[PDB]
User: Fold this.
Amino acid sequence: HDVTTDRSQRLTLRFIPVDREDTAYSYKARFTLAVGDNRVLDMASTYFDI
Amino acid sequence: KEIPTPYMWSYQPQMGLAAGAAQDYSTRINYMSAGPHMISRVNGIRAHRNRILLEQAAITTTPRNNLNPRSWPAALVYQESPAPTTVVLPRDAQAEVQMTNSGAQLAGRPSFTPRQAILTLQTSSSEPRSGGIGTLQFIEEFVPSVYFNPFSGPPGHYPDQFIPNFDAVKDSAD
Amino acid sequence: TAVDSITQKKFLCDRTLWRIPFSSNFMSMGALTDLGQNLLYANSAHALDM
Assistant:
């Protein structure tokens, strides 16, 4: 009754940066990750990829 | 429109809520069956079991706070109370302890000391059903509160409560 | 030595069973799971294709 939504909401998503630096020993991944409206994000389940 | 298209309610034993109220052909009249002079009959007395349907909708129904609720209370929905079946004792405890510790062995009101000693054994449930209806009292609860106007008033919570998926909390939900 | 080979990857599920809860919150809550006791469900007979 008050736990679930019946409209459009997103689970398990992919975010990719547009600009990146490639050097000898450093790699900066500059994501522009802005978390969506009416939504809180748990962060023991927020991870990268190679 | 002017001839009221009759509803009813039929029951589900899984929850205790109405499955739906529909303008049912599961009773509706064999069309253009009557006679041209005797056709004012079905325009009158087919509307008669529509006009005793209004009588039946208030006879034992017990009018509800919201025309189709969600979770029902315990008052006047026939909550059965079978009386505590009271029996004393098959064998006596006080007559058995004294003999078996000192001497004799037994296999059995009894032989030595007959006496009445009873405790209350309440059968009826601590609290009645909050889930839904007892299985057959549906005429006593749900009889069509028919509205002959198909849609009357501005859209909000008008004369509504026909669809089973239509809840009081959410206007329109999946 | 270097020869030209590629990695092949697989997984093994043995003595474990597949499971998905009948909840819109996707949780093993109880008997009357979130989508079971919902509004549209348990009211009308329909057809199924999987």
The interface with chain B takes residues 1, 6 of chain A (CB under 8 Å). Chain A has no helices and two strands. The CA atoms of residues 15 and 33 of chain A lie 7 Å apart. The radius of gyration of chain A is 16 Å.
